[PDB]
Write a protein that binds this ligand. Structure first.
Ligand code: B12
Ligand code: TTP
Ligand code: TTP
Ligand code: 5AD
Ligand code: CL
Ligand code: CO
Ligand code: MG
Ligand code: MG
Lengths: 607, 611
């Protein structure tokens, strides 16, 4: 059906009292006296839609006469899509849209908006108007660069950004410092400062596997409570796998130190596994794998991710995200690829426009975003969608469907970026990117869909016109999925029921209302359906939660999506409390064989 | 006696075994490979004198055809004064003079030096060539400013500076924050970040004003912040605060960017401070209002903070280099050789002012603030030992009159020298807007305890016209440089007459000259044990009275000595008010009230047995 039909079915559906708490809590704009400027989700949609459609001011394809019409059109479509909660941008966009803009412009009826009005919104966006979630900054090997980075951290965190860095440039603890004839503190010690900084104003800290301080880093939490830590693998994944299998040795070294050392790669991996087994940190960041698909590599280079891993970013680059709720696209046992296609084109445009009306706390970031125009279009509602299609999450069926769904989005996303590159101009760096200097460059692995051939061609076309360097991600959507009363990102539901009691909205519609009342006592207790008597088999099988799905089944779902995502993916590999450190190692080894670009594990009941 | 002859008496007196250990440890320069480029104090003196003499290149009264001879004469005089240890600049000068310069230039014999050698020295000073002890930077009420200040702490600390800040601009904990509708973390929380920053760079002063809404929390901050010394700031008139106390009044704690507002009994507030200092020796008191009363640039510029040890009150981004004269070496048959001292004060002021010219700061704002004000910190050390030689008890009116007079004498000549240097090299850029020119009868200290007052007043009138420096004097702890000079520290009494640090024996050398060597071997054991002569039998009453140590001297006599000196010092003074273990919190409060009445610009107390 038409997207406009789908909008009708949804646009009048108000958020659950549950989502309404979150909204009143931190999304509804309040003035300085504290009073509410927004009291209904609808008000948010209007403000955001109006701000992001303002970008069309810059559109060189629009005649000045029609300029007001075009803008009003995009506002409306952005608005409708936003109010129906079919697509939602990252929290910073919802938080900060229109900050600095007069309160008489952001909500007034769209029929009263003049060109004057929009031009005014554009000009009055203030230094707080920061609409992107994900940042990376470098941390150079000097006191000067280090503390400039600490300041950068505080500035980005102030405006609601999440920032990460690779700290491997910092020379190892004990290394010679010429300027003081003393000895260097080492990266782990400096990280404590970044931590202290943020504790008064969420972070990704990466150290490469071959840094002499890697071992101290791996145990750094047992303090750095505001960091997620990942171990960095800048080399090819194949290469590390090979070394591990040969029980080979890895040389720890650094350019600005005489400190060097041999360590068994297996012992290094076991150290990481043990710590992760204990506490869920550190993760693995396959940086070399990210650059392999980075269109600007090696002119520019990905060294780190944002805090949740889903976006690989070069120095000073930032990325804005948004997700589509695919559970809302269910229609009589099928995914509505007609409405969805339309929505992808709209979302890519919305996200690309966000860049235009975005304000960053640092000029180097502004430059980097303008050069690349990286976007992060993703999905939520996936698990709930499977529930509707009655497909077990932990099944090859699920994974084939997943790869297929992502492929479709990937194809239409890059299609749209082609058209946007045509209408508005390419990203300035297209010319030096592999989309131009290579033949058959594809931003991701593929190999699990019938769509591949059509994707391979649309990549060829972006040799001439491309608005964005990369387009796709799967984020955690923790907060925006609660607003969209749907499941989070690509994750299965963690629980089907929990306390006022809640029961999954889709389980509610399949299961016999009678049974629901009986088993619920046990369900909230055991957090699963699989050992509850007299529940239809195919309901136990369909309505699986995170912990019903074994580690490998989580991994391979991540693989499936990653094959059609040119950025990274947020995926927790959940693990039974009974898992051993070896079980964790096996996940790492398997991960090295798949196409995943990062690994995060959490063993149930370990913290 | 001419200075040149005092120099001969001291120049070949070798530093003690103790001083040489310190010099080897930290002051003798090394190459990248840990090898010694310097092995004797003489080498340090040559290096420093040469680098500081190099400033004379910039001297507009020298002709291109005389500069070489004038520079060599200054290096010569600087060298001999230094080697003799009659005057020694602050540690960073000893540490960093010469950094960047070819090693075959820094110790080359002076007779072989060319005009091009000196210009090469001047040009090769590297970014680490930072020769000043004392810095203050602002910390504005924004995330931007805060972390810019943290960055500055790191940079200043790297190159060897000590930095202080007044944190009172930071809005109270819990205050409204516009950009996030969040709540401010507060000055105390932010100070934890500055502390964390210093913890990884291998010392700070932290001030919060008495009327800040978080003052109570600040006062309790260390009861974490291990690198900070903390003082409470008093930006109002000392008189106003004493009167409020005496009238049992209340103080409005408020802040301009916060609705967080509160009333407190100034007496309860003081007792809290005194209670804390009683336990732990912190926080101190900083009389900023009293510093500003005497600040030649107030109120265009304002002193909001001191450096870590409190002796220099500095405006934002201002820095100051210090140097101290060992007055114990000026003792000559029962009197202070004022003829020699006058000459050394003249040379010392020029040396310190030259340091500015060859200094390299890590931040442009600092560089600018120093060039505009040219503030100096000439002080003294060896004061206690000098009193030992004159046979004057530290805890007497006689000693305090002597001190005020000694200090007035130095101040007169240092300031006369500034006039001269301003006439020769140019005035400090801001003279024109200072109170030396805009005001009549401006004197930058209280006076009132010397026959030198009228003469000081005359010279201050003169400096309306010519003046090289905004201020010239201080008394520093001189913890390390007094050890190098083998003399007592700053204006402090000796803490002990016989002791050991980490190691071995220090035994006061003036004691070792007066006391009967027989009686010395006798009491030596008891002395180290009891840390004082006070009640050791078989020791002459005369000696007991002169050879008093810090804890022999009651708190008021410590305080009154500080006041005597402060009447003739244009910056501030580092002084510990030592108190006996039996001291009460009321005893502390009394020290405070008396401090409010005297001319001291700050107060630090320590009760024996606190920590
Ligand atoms: C400079 C100084 C400081 C500095 C040191 C940093 C710097 N900028 O150099 C600062 C501001 C941190 C400081 C603080 C205090 N100090 Co203090 N300090 C001195 C001073 C004047 C210099 C000593 C020195 O540099 N020696 C040379 C080096 C080579 O020898 P060192 O032994 O290795 O020096 C180190 C230690 O002495 C240490 N240190 C500093 N203060 C204290 C105090 C004690 C009790 C100890 C054990 C060590 C110690 O710091 C030095 C390295 O920086 C001496 C008095 C003197 N001797 O002239 C005191 C002195 C040791 N300090 C003293 C005191 C009491 C304090 C405070 C507790 C008092 C207060 N009111 O705040 C505070 C708190 C810190 C502490 N004591 O733990 C007393 C000790 C009394 C006693 N019975 O032990 C002394 C003797 C001063 C006095 N006139 O009474 N101090
Ligand atoms: C100055 C200083 C640096 N460091 C660390 C921070 C950086 O990782 C590294 C480089 O510091 P830098 O600030 O660049 O030191 P430098 O230029 O004076 O010396 P060099 O040329 O040898 O680099 O050393 C410390 O750990 N402690 C210190 O006191
Ligand atoms: C942004 C922020 C500020 N602060 C404190 C630090 C400063 O003391 C003070 C001001 O910070 P600012 O950086 O000035 O915050 P702001 O400009 O957005 O808010 P306002 O316009 O009201 O000044 O608030 C925090 O404690 N946490 C924070 O997250
Ligand atoms: C022992 C040395 O420590 C310095 N010191 C310790 N605390 C302070 C303070 N709060 N203010 C000024 N100086 C202080 C004293 O000035 C003394 O010289
Ligand atoms: Cl195990
Ligand atoms: Co979580
Ligand atoms: Mg360096
Ligand atoms: Mg502000």
């Amino acid at each position: 059906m038409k997207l406009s039909d789908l909008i009708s079915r949804w646009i009048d559906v108000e958020p659950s009292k549950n989502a309404q708490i979150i909204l009143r809590d931190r999304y509804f704009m309040k003035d300085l006296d504290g009073n509410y400027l927004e009291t209904k989700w609808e008000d948010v949609a209007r403000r955001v839609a109006r701000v992001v459609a303002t970008a069309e001011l810059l559109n060189p394809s629009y005649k000045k006469n029609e300029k007001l019409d075009r803008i009003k059109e995009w506002e409306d479509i952005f608005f409708r899509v936003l109010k129906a909660r079919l697509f939602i941008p990252n929290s910073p966009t919802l938080f900060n849209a229109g900050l600095g803009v007069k309160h008489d412009l952001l909500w007034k009826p769209i029929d009263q908006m003049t060109l004057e009005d929009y031009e005014e919104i554009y000009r009055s966006r203030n230094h707080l108007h920061m609409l992107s979630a994900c940042f990376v900054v470098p941390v150079g090997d000097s006191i000067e660069e280090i503390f400039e980075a600490v300041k950068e951290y505080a500035l980005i965190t102030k405006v609601g950004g999440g920032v990460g860095s690779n700290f491997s440039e910092l020379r190892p603890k004990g290394s010679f410092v010429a300027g003081t004839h003393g000895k260097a503190s080492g990266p782990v010690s400096f990280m404590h400062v970044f931590n202290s900084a943020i504790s008064v104003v969420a972070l990704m800290g990466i150290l490469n596997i071959n840094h002499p301080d890697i071992e101290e880093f791996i145990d750094a939490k047992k303090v750095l409570n505001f960091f997620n830590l990942s171990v960095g693998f800048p080399m090819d994944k194949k290469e590390i796998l090979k070394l591990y299998e040969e029980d080979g040795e890895l040389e720890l070294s650094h350019p600005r130190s005489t400190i060097r050392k041999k360590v068994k790669i297996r012992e290094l991996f076991r150290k990481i596994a043990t710590n992760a087994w204990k506490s869920g940190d550190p993760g693995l960041a396959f940086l070399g794998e990210m650059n392999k698909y980075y269109p600007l590599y090696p002119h520019r280079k990905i060294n780190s991710t944002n805090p949740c891993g889903e976006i690989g970013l070069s120095d000073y680059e930032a990325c804005n995200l948004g997700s589509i709720d695919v559970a809302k696209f269910y229609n009589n046992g099928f995914v509505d690829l007609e409405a969805l296609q339309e929505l992808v084109q709209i979302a890519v445009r919305f996200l690309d426009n966000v860049i235009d009306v975005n304000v960053f706390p640092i000029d180097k970031i502004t430059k980097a975003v303008k050069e690349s125009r990286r976007l992060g279009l993703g999905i939520m509602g996936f698990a709930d969608l499977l529930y509707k299609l009655e497909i077990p999450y932990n099944s090859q069926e699920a994974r084939d469907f997943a790869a297929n769904l992502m492929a479709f989005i990937a194809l239409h996303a890059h299609r749209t970026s082609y058209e946007l590159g045509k209408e508005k101009g390419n990203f300035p760096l297209l010319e030096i990117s592999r989309y131009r200097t290579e033949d058959n460059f594809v931003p991701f692995a593929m190999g699990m869909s019938n769509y591949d051939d059509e994707i391979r061609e649309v990549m060829k076309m972006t040799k001439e016109f491309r608005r964005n360097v990369a387009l796709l991600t799967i984020a955690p959507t923790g907060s925006i999925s609660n607003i969209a009363d749907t499941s989070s990102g690509l994750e299965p539901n963690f629980l089907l029921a929990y306390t006022l009691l809640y029961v999954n909205q889709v389980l509610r519609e399949k299961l016999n209302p009678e049974i629901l009342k009986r088993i619920e006592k046990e369900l909230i207790e055991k957090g699963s359906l699989k050992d509850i008597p007299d529940v239809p088999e195919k309901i136990k099988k369909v309505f699986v939660v995170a912990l019903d799905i074994d580690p490998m089944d989580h991994l391979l779902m991540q693989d499936a999506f990653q094959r059609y995502v040119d950025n990274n993916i947020s995926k927790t590999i959940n693990m039974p409390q009974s898992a051993t450190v070896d079980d964790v190692l096996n996940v790492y080894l398997e991960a090295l064989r798949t196409n995943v670009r990062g690994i995060t594990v959490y063993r149930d009941g370990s913290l």
